[PDB]
Amino acid sequence: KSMHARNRYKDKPPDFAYLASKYPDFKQHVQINLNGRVSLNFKDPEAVRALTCTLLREDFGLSIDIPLERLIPTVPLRLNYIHWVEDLIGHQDSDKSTLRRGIDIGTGASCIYPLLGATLNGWYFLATEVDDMCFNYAKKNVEQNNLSDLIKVVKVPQKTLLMDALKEESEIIYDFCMCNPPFITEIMAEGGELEFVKRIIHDSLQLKKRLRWYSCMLGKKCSLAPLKEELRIQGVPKVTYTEFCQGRTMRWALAWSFYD
Numbered sequence: 001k002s003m004h005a006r007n008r009y010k011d012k013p014p015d016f017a018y019l020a021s022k023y024p025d026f027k028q029h030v031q032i033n034l035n036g037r038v039s040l041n042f043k044d045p046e047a048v049r050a051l052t053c054t055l056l057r058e059d060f061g062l063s064i065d066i067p068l069e070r071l072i073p074t075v076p077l078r079l080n081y082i083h084w085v086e087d088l089i090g091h092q093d094s095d096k097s098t099l100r101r102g103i104d105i106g107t108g109a110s111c112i113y114p115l116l117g118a119t120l121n122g123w124y125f126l127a128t129e130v131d132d133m134c135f136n137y138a139k140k141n142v143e144q145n146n147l148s149d150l151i152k153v154v155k156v157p158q159k160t161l162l163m164d165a166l167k168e169e170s171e172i173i174y175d176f177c178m179c180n181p182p183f184i185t186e187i188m189a190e191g192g193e194l195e196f197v198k199r200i201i202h203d204s205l206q207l208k209k210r211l212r213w214y215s216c217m218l219g220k221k222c223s224l225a226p227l228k229e230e231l232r233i234q235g236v237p238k239v240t241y242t243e244f245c246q247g248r249t250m251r252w253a254l255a256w257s258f259y260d
């Protein structure tokens with residue numbers, strides 16, 4: 001399955017030529033290809049950073065500052081997750097009177113899911129990070145876009161996930177959590193992604209209805225089936241999944257709930 005139908009980049013892909021004409025810091029990172037078209041080297045982190053900062057500024061009015069030494073997100077791909085969560089929670093069929101409350105697990109230096117969700121929909125976020133650099137940058141990025149009344153960035157300890165974040169300080173009910181990557185013997189090892197999502201499932205079995213939906217965007221096709229099986233085993237009553245992509249960058253979205 002392709003881009004989300006409501007993704008703005010579905011039928012308006014980024015125009016490199018337009019962006020080069022308007023943004024001189026972006027222009028210094030593009031070149032002309034064989035076809036005579038403005039292009040970008042997607043293996044150069046400086047160029048990828050410029051594209052991402054430029055798109056956020058152009059299409060969302062967001063100014064962000066991010067390091068070369070931490071993950072640089074790809075904006076069109078992230079929007080698919082935002083629109084999917086919108087579908088999960090019934091966002092299209094409600095109005096502004098309903099405030100929504102999300103958790104972004106491992107928000108990254110860009111704090112991108114909360115910035116997009118707060119900007120587009122006025123959603124609140126608790127945004128967690130274990131990494132010091134990512135935490136600091138995420139926090140500057142929220143503050144420089146004046147979104148700290150909607151987005152609370154928190155450094156959490158290394159070993160913790162959802163439960164340790166949600167105590168007497170917490171909101172009673174959250175609408176969703178979000179999470180994406182990175183995360184002789186016959187038996188294959190679980191690997192990083194499968195282990196990590198299983199920690200989310202484990203916390204969800206304690207929290208139950210304190211969140212309306214648990215979700216995670218998977219980077220590996222092979223994660224999906226064993227995650228579904230673990231959910232079946234545990235009696236989780238409502239499971240849904242789908243797929244999204246931006247060119248070759250593929251994702252498998254999985255969400256579950258303890259509500260009927």
Ligand SMILES: Nc1ncnc2c1ncn2[C@@H]1O[C@H](CSCC[C@H](N)C(=O)O)[C@@H](O)[C@H]1O
Pocket residue numbers: 071073105106107108109110112113128129130131134156158159160161179180181182183
């Ligand atoms: N248990 C945990 N709690 C919070 N953040 C975590 C975590 N384990 C890993 N992370 C963070 O998860 C991130 C990688 S996965 C999420 C990527 C993020 N949405 C982005 O766009 O950058 C890293 O920033 C890492 O520091």
